Amino acid sequence: YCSHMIGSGHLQSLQRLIDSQMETSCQITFEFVDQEQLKDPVCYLKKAFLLVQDIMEDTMRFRDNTPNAIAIVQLQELSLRLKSCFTKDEHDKACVRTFYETPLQLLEKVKNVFNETKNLLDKDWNIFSKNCNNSFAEC
Amino acid sequence: VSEYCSHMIGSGHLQSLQRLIDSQMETSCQITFEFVDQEQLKDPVCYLKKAFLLVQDIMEDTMRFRDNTPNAIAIVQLQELSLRLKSCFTKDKACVRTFYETPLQLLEKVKNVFNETKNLLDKDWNIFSKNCNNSFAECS
Secondary structure (H helix, E strand, C coil): CCCCCHHHHHHHHHHHHHHHCCCCCCCCCCEECCCCCCCHHHHHHHHHHHHHHHHHHCCCCCCCCHHHHHHHHHHHHHHHHHHHHHCCCCCCCCCCCEEEEEEHHHHHHHHHHHHHHHHHHCCCCCCCCCCCCCCHHCC | CCCHCCCCCHHHHHHHHHHHHHCCCCCCEEEEEEEECCCCCHHHHHHHHHHHHHHHHHHCCCCCCCCHHHHHHHHHHHHHHHHCCCCCCCCCCCCEEEEEEEEHHHHHHHHHHHHHHHHHHHHCHHHHHCCCCHHHCCCC
């Protein structure tokens, strides 16, 4: 069931959202995974996915009843069900750093999480049952 | 100037701007851009004249969207509009200041220049043939 939970539709509402944002110098603050501390690809997605949930709630806010706003709602609802595909190991700031980048650099991070997560669930529905207490400990 | 400017700016433009604004993510960030200072330039007409010019720099340089997106074309259209509006403004970095405000605050300023410009042209399409040399000179 986890396999095809993330549909192409979610990816396209993300892309549209990414394509709608203005290209400026603007830089914002947000917590996200540190690639240099967390090398393991699978564990990276496990943690990123959780930090994304906060990012969609706290940072990614759009005027109510707009395509992008509703797009975010969808993703959040989807995520609540995706959680069951991820066995808990979290919400502890291990392997985490503060970022200062553009909203576009951010949204790209979020898009890649959903993308890679989708590709890997379609292929190995059981992939995220892996124990990442080891990787999380070595950060 | 002619009656060619009486209804140059239609609601379609203002409504594409609001849509362009509503689609942006609400952020705390602040960006840099050069705009008019209401204090240095007190004259409402001459204020809109210069703001209109600066908006041209802002559309091209600051308000950039990915090619082939509804917003990029909305900007292209607003630039096609401005090209035509130039026949309504008679030729004359004075009265200019650098603003450090959020992107949405900027887009709101742009909207107000087309919004307040639209209202006056409908009433007096020959309004921007005004000589604003004297007002631009008294700016510090």
